[PDB]
Amino acid sequence: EGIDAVYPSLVGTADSKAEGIKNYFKLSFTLPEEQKSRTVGSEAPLKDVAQALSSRARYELFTEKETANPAFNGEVIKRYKELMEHGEGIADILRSRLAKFLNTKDVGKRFAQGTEANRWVGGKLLNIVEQDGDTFKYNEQLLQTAVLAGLQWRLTATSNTAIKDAKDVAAITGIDQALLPEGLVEQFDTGMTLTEAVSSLAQKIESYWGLSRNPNAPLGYTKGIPTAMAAEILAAFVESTDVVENIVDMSEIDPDNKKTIGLYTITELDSFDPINSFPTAIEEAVLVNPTEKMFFGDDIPPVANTQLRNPAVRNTPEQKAALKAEQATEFYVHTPMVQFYETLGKDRILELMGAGTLNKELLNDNHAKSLEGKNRSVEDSYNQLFSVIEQVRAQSEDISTVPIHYAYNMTRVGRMQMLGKYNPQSAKLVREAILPTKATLDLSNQNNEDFSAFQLGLAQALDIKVHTMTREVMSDELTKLLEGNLKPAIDMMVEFNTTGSLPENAVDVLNTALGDRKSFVALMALMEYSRYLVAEDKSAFVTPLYVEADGVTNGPINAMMLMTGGLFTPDWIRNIAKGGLFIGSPNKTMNEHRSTADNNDLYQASTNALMESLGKLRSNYASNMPIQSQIDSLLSLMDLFLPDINLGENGALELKRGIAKNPLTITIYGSGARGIAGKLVSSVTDAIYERMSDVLKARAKDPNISAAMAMFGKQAASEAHAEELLARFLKDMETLTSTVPVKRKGVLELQSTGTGAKGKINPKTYTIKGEQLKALQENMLHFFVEPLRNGITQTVGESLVYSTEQLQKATQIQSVVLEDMFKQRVQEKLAEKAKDPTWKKGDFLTQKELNDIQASLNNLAPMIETGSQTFYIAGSENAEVANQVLATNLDDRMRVPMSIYAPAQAGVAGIPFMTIGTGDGMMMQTLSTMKGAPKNTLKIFDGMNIGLNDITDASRKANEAVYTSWQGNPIKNVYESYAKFMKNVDFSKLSPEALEAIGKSALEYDQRENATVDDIANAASLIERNLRNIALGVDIRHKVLDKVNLSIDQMAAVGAPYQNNGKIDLSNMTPEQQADELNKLFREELEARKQKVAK
């Protein structure tokens, strides 16, 4: 009688075992104990809410608050009057589409005779209708409340959707990640798919309805009825031209693919629309506890209870404390930076920091696609920032004294991420306008310690390697720039502060002065320095300039410290010193190491090893003439378009440290050899497309120019030199696309493909794809990637790559078993429902039944616990388990598949989870909750912005947090979960498909052709004892390193190292001598543990 008294006019009885028509709306939802929405019980929600928005006094009375938001002024009130009238016309469209549905094929006539038309996949909206004469009609309270949710969704959906990477697009389309076309990713994130639009809209509808789900009701109605309403509202928005629908066909690019995907984009409002200063008036008027809002002053966001998009995992108490500290920081608006942005204008901002205007008649088709994506990011960030400024400006007359708070949540890899799309932590344009840092300095004397901090901040913003030089040397470098190239730019900024105007050629002045140092952070350095020059009182200068403590190769260094076992080697000691770990050198900073000891970082070290491997490969095939020519063509092509590859006049090959940046970072991230090859080739094709645009530009200026000079005009001193380069380009492309190398029996053989490149090119629409693209990747994989991966292994160590292999095998095997049991357990439950008369196919399972299936998997240890963090590698949301349609609209379109939260195969995702989660993720968690933690800082991943008044103390604390995170044992945590899984697993109950996947990870190629169940089980237990041996070695190494004196300078910006107060002196020793001393303590620790066990 609870919900049966609020909606007594609904069609059908509320009994699950009735005879006629049953109402599944009242059987699936229940009234809450305390109210959550103010529209429950009303008769005209679209009229009561519109009345409350007509005045400030009425808004306060309806909301029951002392005062309303100051931004809710008269201009905003007028704009909401038109929006409410627009929402009344949306309801008229919905009411007219229902009458057509009941008229075609006599649906209404049959439904009134007893036919269960409300249980259809498209008739699920018949559970919220009422009888009216001989026909049916909507329920006014339920219909008008859903319209209000659509209006709020239309205003803020874009600024809340997630960002799709290349991996996500590949899964949706089905095309291989390494063969994704040009601009496909940039097209996908512009709009949203059907599933994303409907699911997000349906979430708001349920919230506004203010009801609670029934745990014993089928998932086909608790999730289908809200979804069926969302699809109808989205269809109405398309008819009203509020949402534009675009259809992309995969058969155009891949004829073998028959998938069709629709994309929906919301039409955006004007940048001067007064509604942009307060777009959450409807949300705060309906919900008792609004979710979308901006926090001012003492308004502190609440702490989330579960991980991001991982509802099965809850934040640990240690993780919740870190979130609370990060949400207490106050942000402030820098007025001089804001006025500079609006004076320059959006057009000049795009011209300076973007691609500017585009003339598509002189651009390549593929080149123009990338330029538009660059412009979109800058333009969207500019619009988002100035909408916030409008809201802040209404709170007080002084915009610089309004504190701002931001919400945080935990990423599945243990990373604190700001909520929203464009915020200081994500957008660089917004980062320079809203700052949490402040300082007061005495700059009346140039020899003060305060002036040295001021110079350090300016130098780092102007692209100067401050962590590789001493303070005195850095000061000399900055002085030359200030009085040299940057002088014209400073003069313009000085006039701007006093007057407030800019010249018509301001873009050209900044472009010439900055050059290769152009960035958003470099603009603030010019303004801050110019403001200091005109300050009347330099002894109390207040500035928001900061210094960023950036880690030196944070990724690779963490891996070699956390997942390395065995005895110490001199090579490890030398290579780990480049990361900031010094043994036997008290109070040694990174600036001293680079200046005197070693000036090569990890990126340069791997480049040198790559040259060594490349020379050995050529010498192996010295007698093979066809193989030698193929290697020459690959290097020749990369020399023409990549600045990191250079060939001398004598044929000597020279490489730069910039060729191993990306490969080294993604190698630690578990990416395979094919992934590196695909990215390397993509860099070459981008340069080729850009060179085609120069051909079109040169032809327009001079139609009589030659083809060679139109291409390599600026890369050749004479015309004859230009003709030489053109011949090289044509020959290399034909050679690299005609034959490919095939690795058989351990040797490489050239095999023809028959799909070589022929004909005359067209600069406007030149494209490389199909079999031509695959031929290029085959040559790159076997001739350049293989030598590259050998050099990387030599630097990081052979033991580190051994730990990654066992970790990948252990996680993949566990995920395969979990996925098979989940699918095998929901099919047995469905077979039981077939004997239930009150059950129909399409209702799926129940939330109570789904929770029992997941609880039965607890004896296999699906989650990894480290004591302060939790990880769930196999968790995902997929529609494979349900394999059925959830709901459609009244036109039998917009079919939405049903997706549930079920485990899935891991693959190579195990390595990134533990390298990042226990690496920089744990370091930043400690830094926010440690004793005497730094205050007023912005914590970007592997970085931290610090004010000029606390650079020394905060840098020392950052190095202390790094040392704490190096005492962990990620392998031991994985071993403990894997040992429990092996105790309870039963391989004899696995499907034949599952047994084939496990054999691909535990056995060799020859051993898995006819392997039995016993062979697979025996091979899986071997991995268990491999993890135990690795984990024991890591534990001993950390114990030994804690007994000696160490200096930690991983955050090398300032030069404030941290000492571990060890009591063993290893100074005045070579790395060869230190390894022997460390190995002596390693053998003593092993003996004690074995002796203790014996006792």
XYZ file of N, CA and C in Angstrom, residues 391-510:
360
model
N 30.645 32.617 -13.049
C 29.983 32.215 -11.812
C 30.723 32.740 -10.587
N 32.057 32.693 -10.609
C 32.839 33.163 -9.470
C 32.693 34.671 -9.303
N 32.586 35.402 -10.415
C 32.501 36.857 -10.350
C 31.240 37.340 -9.645
N 30.206 36.504 -9.560
C 28.961 36.895 -8.913
C 28.972 36.680 -7.406
N 29.931 35.913 -6.881
C 29.956 35.644 -5.448
C 30.456 36.842 -4.650
N 31.390 37.612 -5.204
C 31.949 38.751 -4.490
C 32.498 39.749 -5.496
N 32.720 40.976 -5.018
C 33.265 42.018 -5.881
C 34.731 41.766 -6.207
N 35.475 41.161 -5.284
C 36.882 40.823 -5.494
C 36.955 39.345 -5.861
N 37.208 39.069 -7.142
C 37.209 37.698 -7.635
C 38.403 36.902 -7.122
N 39.446 37.572 -6.639
C 40.671 36.903 -6.222
C 40.635 36.425 -4.776
N 39.520 36.616 -4.068
C 39.411 36.223 -2.667
C 38.302 35.201 -2.437
N 37.923 34.452 -3.466
C 36.866 33.451 -3.379
C 37.523 32.073 -3.426
N 37.551 31.329 -2.322
C 38.136 29.985 -2.355
C 37.295 29.026 -3.182
N 37.974 28.066 -3.806
C 37.339 27.063 -4.652
C 37.845 25.689 -4.240
N 36.929 24.727 -4.148
C 37.259 23.351 -3.810
C 36.883 22.433 -4.965
N 37.615 21.327 -5.089
C 37.425 20.379 -6.175
C 37.220 18.980 -5.612
N 36.447 18.177 -6.336
C 36.163 16.807 -5.940
C 37.195 15.853 -6.526
N 37.454 14.769 -5.799
C 38.447 13.780 -6.189
C 37.867 12.380 -6.046
N 38.468 11.439 -6.770
C 38.094 10.036 -6.673
C 39.295 9.179 -7.050
N 39.230 7.905 -6.675
C 40.332 6.979 -6.895
C 40.151 6.240 -8.215
N 41.173 6.302 -9.062
C 41.186 5.546 -10.302
C 41.453 4.071 -9.996
N 41.072 3.200 -10.935
C 41.249 1.765 -10.740
C 42.713 1.373 -10.577
N 43.644 2.232 -10.979
C 45.065 1.987 -10.776
C 45.601 2.773 -9.577
N 44.729 3.159 -8.651
C 45.147 3.880 -7.461
C 45.686 5.273 -7.708
N 45.032 6.045 -8.571
C 45.433 7.413 -8.871
C 44.313 8.368 -8.487
N 44.671 9.456 -7.809
C 43.709 10.501 -7.479
C 43.495 11.388 -8.698
N 42.263 11.431 -9.195
C 41.930 12.166 -10.407
C 40.813 13.157 -10.116
N 40.990 14.393 -10.574
C 39.956 15.405 -10.422
C 38.740 15.058 -11.270
N 37.555 15.299 -10.718
C 36.319 15.074 -11.452
C 36.088 16.200 -12.451
N 35.602 15.838 -13.629
C 35.350 16.783 -14.696
C 36.250 16.537 -15.891
N 36.005 17.320 -16.940
C 36.766 17.199 -18.177
C 37.943 18.167 -18.224
N 37.693 19.449 -17.960
C 38.724 20.481 -18.001
C 38.836 21.114 -16.621
N 39.962 20.875 -15.957
C 40.241 21.395 -14.625
C 41.729 21.722 -14.545
N 42.205 22.358 -13.470
C 43.647 22.652 -13.387
C 44.536 21.427 -13.513
N 44.084 20.262 -13.049
C 44.908 19.061 -13.112
C 44.985 18.460 -14.511
N 44.059 18.806 -15.404
C 44.001 18.210 -16.733
C 44.354 19.185 -17.846
N 43.784 20.386 -17.829
C 43.980 21.360 -18.893
C 45.094 22.326 -18.514
N 46.040 22.525 -19.436
C 47.144 23.442 -19.176
C 46.699 24.895 -19.250
N 45.693 25.196 -20.076
C 45.171 26.557 -20.139
C 44.536 26.965 -18.815
N 43.758 26.067 -18.206
C 43.134 26.359 -16.923
C 44.147 26.310 -15.788
N 45.244 25.567 -15.963
C 46.243 25.448 -14.906
C 46.903 26.786 -14.596
N 47.064 27.648 -15.596
C 47.743 28.924 -15.412
C 46.813 30.039 -14.955
N 45.524 29.757 -14.764
C 44.568 30.770 -14.338
C 44.030 30.553 -12.933
N 43.980 29.310 -12.463
C 43.510 28.985 -11.121
C 44.630 28.242 -10.407
N 45.122 28.819 -9.315
C 46.281 28.292 -8.616
C 45.983 28.099 -7.138
N 46.522 27.041 -6.534
C 46.471 26.887 -5.071
C 47.714 27.374 -4.335
N 48.686 27.951 -5.036
C 49.959 28.347 -4.456
C 50.043 29.862 -4.325
N 50.767 30.309 -3.302
C 50.985 31.729 -3.067
C 52.268 31.891 -2.267
N 52.875 33.071 -2.385
C 54.125 33.343 -1.691
C 54.339 34.845 -1.602
N 55.114 35.247 -0.597
C 55.548 36.626 -0.423
C 57.067 36.638 -0.345
N 57.700 37.443 -1.195
C 59.147 37.427 -1.342
C 59.715 38.828 -1.168
N 60.980 38.883 -0.765
C 61.727 40.129 -0.621
C 62.725 40.185 -1.774
N 62.359 40.899 -2.838
C 63.183 40.999 -4.036
C 63.885 42.348 -4.147
N 64.107 43.027 -3.020
C 64.798 44.311 -3.048
C 66.292 44.158 -3.298
N 66.843 42.964 -3.091
C 68.252 42.691 -3.329
C 68.381 41.452 -4.199
N 69.319 41.494 -5.146
C 69.505 40.389 -6.076
C 70.337 39.253 -5.497
N 70.922 39.432 -4.315
C 71.715 38.397 -3.669
C 70.948 37.672 -2.571
N 69.670 37.992 -2.387
C 68.869 37.337 -1.366
C 68.536 35.905 -1.775
N 68.267 35.072 -0.767
C 67.812 33.713 -1.032
C 66.405 33.684 -1.611
N 65.615 34.737 -1.390
C 64.285 34.804 -1.984
C 64.363 35.046 -3.485
N 65.349 35.830 -3.929
C 65.497 36.090 -5.357
C 65.971 34.854 -6.109
N 66.731 33.978 -5.448
C 67.159 32.742 -6.091
C 65.980 31.821 -6.375
N 64.984 31.800 -5.486
C 63.782 31.013 -5.744
C 62.959 31.623 -6.871
N 62.937 32.954 -6.959
C 62.232 33.616 -8.051
C 62.870 33.294 -9.395
N 64.203 33.280 -9.450
C 64.893 32.961 -10.697
C 64.690 31.502 -11.087
N 64.649 30.603 -10.100
C 64.476 29.185 -10.395
C 63.121 28.914 -11.037
N 62.072 29.581 -10.554
C 60.753 29.383 -11.132
C 60.652 29.891 -12.558
N 61.267 31.042 -12.839
C 61.224 31.592 -14.190
C 62.006 30.726 -15.170
N 63.178 30.236 -14.756
C 64.007 29.438 -15.654
C 63.314 28.140 -16.049
N 62.674 27.469 -15.088
C 61.995 26.214 -15.392
C 60.815 26.422 -16.332
N 60.158 27.580 -16.257
C 59.030 27.855 -17.139
C 59.468 28.166 -18.564
N 60.727 28.561 -18.764
C 61.247 28.894 -20.085
C 62.039 27.745 -20.703
N 61.727 26.507 -20.316
C 62.335 25.304 -20.886
C 63.853 25.299 -20.690
N 64.259 25.325 -19.424
C 65.660 25.234 -19.033
C 65.808 24.059 -18.079
N 66.787 23.194 -18.347
C 67.017 21.998 -17.538
C 67.666 22.416 -16.222
N 66.819 22.836 -15.279
C 67.309 23.341 -14.003
C 67.844 22.229 -13.112
N 67.471 20.979 -13.370
C 67.899 19.860 -12.541
C 69.219 19.252 -12.994
N 69.844 19.799 -14.037
C 71.123 19.302 -14.531
C 72.241 20.327 -14.395
N 72.030 21.397 -13.633
C 73.022 22.455 -13.515
C 72.924 23.085 -12.134
N 73.990 23.781 -11.749
C 74.033 24.459 -10.464
C 73.246 25.767 -10.524
N 73.008 26.346 -9.343
C 72.223 27.574 -9.261
C 72.921 28.732 -9.965
N 74.242 28.843 -9.802
C 74.977 29.943 -10.418
C 74.936 29.860 -11.941
N 75.078 28.654 -12.494
C 75.043 28.493 -13.945
C 73.655 28.811 -14.487
N 72.607 28.382 -13.778
C 71.245 28.649 -14.229
C 70.958 30.145 -14.256
N 71.459 30.881 -13.262
C 71.231 32.322 -13.215
C 71.853 33.021 -14.418
N 73.052 32.596 -14.821
C 73.694 33.190 -15.988
C 72.895 32.920 -17.257
N 72.348 31.710 -17.389
C 71.561 31.375 -18.572
C 70.295 32.217 -18.656
N 69.632 32.440 -17.519
C 68.400 33.224 -17.518
C 68.669 34.682 -17.870
N 69.810 35.219 -17.433
C 70.117 36.624 -17.686
C 70.263 36.904 -19.177
N 70.896 35.989 -19.917
C 71.064 36.188 -21.353
C 69.720 36.237 -22.067
N 68.792 35.357 -21.685
C 67.477 35.342 -22.319
C 66.702 36.622 -22.033
N 66.771 37.118 -20.794
C 65.976 38.282 -20.414
C 66.409 39.530 -21.173
N 67.713 39.717 -21.356
C 68.237 40.883 -22.055
C 68.433 40.645 -23.545
N 68.097 39.459 -24.046
C 68.292 39.150 -25.447
C 67.007 38.970 -26.228
N 66.645 37.711 -26.489
C 65.482 37.427 -27.324
C 64.183 37.848 -26.645
N 64.101 37.694 -25.323
C 62.857 37.953 -24.608
C 62.633 39.427 -24.299
N 63.599 40.295 -24.597
C 63.439 41.715 -24.290
C 62.260 42.358 -25.014
N 62.056 42.164 -26.324
C 60.866 42.760 -26.957
C 59.554 42.272 -26.370
N 59.485 41.013 -25.934
C 58.248 40.502 -25.350
C 57.999 41.098 -23.971
N 59.063 41.326 -23.199
C 58.908 41.914 -21.872
C 58.455 43.365 -21.981
N 58.964 44.091 -22.979
C 58.562 45.482 -23.166
C 57.073 45.593 -23.469
N 56.546 44.682 -24.292
C 55.117 44.688 -24.586
C 54.293 44.369 -23.344
N 54.759 43.424 -22.523
C 54.027 43.069 -21.312
C 54.077 44.182 -20.274
N 55.175 44.939 -20.228
C 55.274 46.052 -19.287
C 54.221 47.106 -19.600
N 54.046 47.428 -20.883
C 53.031 48.398 -21.276
C 51.623 47.882 -21.006
N 51.416 46.568 -21.103
C 50.090 46.003 -20.876
C 49.636 46.209 -19.435
N 50.547 46.047 -18.474
C 50.169 46.177 -17.070
C 49.716 47.593 -16.739
N 50.430 48.602 -17.244
C 50.093 49.983 -16.915
C 48.875 50.477 -17.687
N 48.707 50.035 -18.931
C 47.650 50.537 -19.802
C 46.504 49.559 -20.004
N 46.794 48.294 -20.277
C 45.763 47.314 -20.542
C 45.440 47.081 -22.000
N 46.339 47.434 -22.916
C 46.110 47.277 -24.343
C 47.279 46.534 -24.972
N 47.008 45.891 -26.107
C 48.009 45.127 -26.828
C 48.092 45.598 -28.276
N 49.259 45.491 -28.903
C 49.390 45.889 -30.307
C 48.727 44.873 -31.231
N 48.514 45.306 -32.475
C 47.881 44.437 -33.461
C 48.775 43.260 -33.834
N 50.088 43.406 -33.672
C 51.052 42.354 -33.989
C 51.582 41.671 -32.735
N 50.725 41.480 -31.730
C 51.163 40.852 -30.488
C 51.542 39.391 -30.691
N 50.851 38.691 -31.592
C 51.156 37.284 -31.837
C 52.545 37.133 -32.444
N 52.896 38.006 -33.391
C 54.207 37.924 -34.028
C 55.326 38.220 -33.037
N 55.101 39.163 -32.121
C 56.122 39.507 -31.135
C 56.401 38.320 -30.221
N 55.340 37.661 -29.745
C 55.520 36.514 -28.863
C 56.087 35.311 -29.607
